[PDB]
């Protein structure tokens, strides 16, 4: 699908509210496999199961290994911009 830019707002006591799978070592993008109800990704409205996360706050995630992506994603705070695409 089309590449989208999506804003997520979260407070410091929360996680993103997603599960991810995939990663470069598996030959696939970082993929959202769950959107947890009521948590920030759900609340922001623009992130969905099946989205590939291409970047976060300008950090490319296209060739990142699974755990690299976990570290990068969990470091982001506050107003967080995602670049995502549904395939």
């Amino acid at each position: 699908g089309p590449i989208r830019k999506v804003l997520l707002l979260k407070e410091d006591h929360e996680g993103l509210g997603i599960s991810i799978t995939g990663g470069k070592e598996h030959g696939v993008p970082i993929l959202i496999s769950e959107i947890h109800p009521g948590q920030p990704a759900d609340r922001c409205g623009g992130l969905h199961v099946g989205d590939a996360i291409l970047a976060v706050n300008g950090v490319n995630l296209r060739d990142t290994k699974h755990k690299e992506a976990v570290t990068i994603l969990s470091q982001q705070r506050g107003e967080i911009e995602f670049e995502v695409v549904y395939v």
């Binding site: 996680g15 993103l16 997603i18 599960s19 991810i20 799978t21 995939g22 990663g23 598996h26 696939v28 496999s33 769950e34 947890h36 699974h66 755990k67 976990v70 994603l73 969990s74």
Partner: peptide, 7 residues
């Protein structure tokens, strides 16, 4: 099989 992480 791929890993899954909750974040």
């Amino acid at each position: 099989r791929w890993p899954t992480s909750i974040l």
